[PDB]
Design a protein around this ligand. Structure first.
Ligand code: U5F
Ligand code: U5F
Length: 124
């Protein structure tokens, strides 16, 4: 299986790099994190901060989730992130992405005891 918290780490955590510097980043990362296995996941964000810093967002600014649930949290500080967006050239299983780097506040949904990120909602 996979816990929701572990799935969030696989899909959205990349503390190893400070920022997307390779235009290849998303093509490589979407594949290696298994987000192109059964389909090209259309949009996905990787966060370039420590796991502790991202987990800490679960105690920061409570905001509504896009789906209407109330368990979303916005980071007080901007964080370094990389948005990966599927191109038009992209046809599964050769999924192609544009790599966009930005510094933005992240919004995650949190659940559980301990209370940890389980879903990436948005960046603002
Ligand atoms: O920044 C993001 C957003 C999403 N995700 C991931 O993608 C999965 C679906 O998330 P969505 O259900 O939200 O698919 P979207 O395309 O984001 O939303 P729509 O376009 O339908 O409506 P909008 O035009 O309002 O969206 P926008 O213009 O960006 O505000 C989600 O589970 C995350 O893993 C992410 O990692 N980083
Ligand atoms: O606003 C929200 C949204 C969700 N949740 C909860 O957060 C948990 C994981 O949410 P998801 O289970 O839906 O996982 P997501 O990160 O959301 O994005 P996707 O599943 O689309 O990516 P894939 O389906 O492609 O996964 P894969 O192909 O295996 O790599 C779940 O318990 C929700 O109830 C939440 O509390 N507030």
């Amino acid at each position: 299986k996979e816990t929701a918290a572990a799935k969030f780490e696989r899909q959205h955590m990349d503390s190893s790099t400070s920022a997307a510097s390779s235009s290849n980043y998303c093509n490589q990362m979407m594949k290696s994190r298994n987000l192109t296995k059964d389909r090209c996941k259309p949009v996905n964000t990787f966060v370039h901060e420590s796991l502790a810093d991202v987990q800490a967002v679960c105690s920061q600014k409570n905001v509504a989730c896009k789906n209407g649930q109330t368990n979303c949290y916005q980071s007080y500080s901007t964080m370094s992130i990389t948005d990966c967006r599927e191109t038009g050239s992209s046809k599964y299983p050769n999924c192609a992405y544009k790599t966009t780097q930005a510094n933005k506040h992240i919004i995650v949904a949190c659940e559980g005891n301990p209370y940890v990120p389980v879903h990436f909602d948005a960046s603002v």
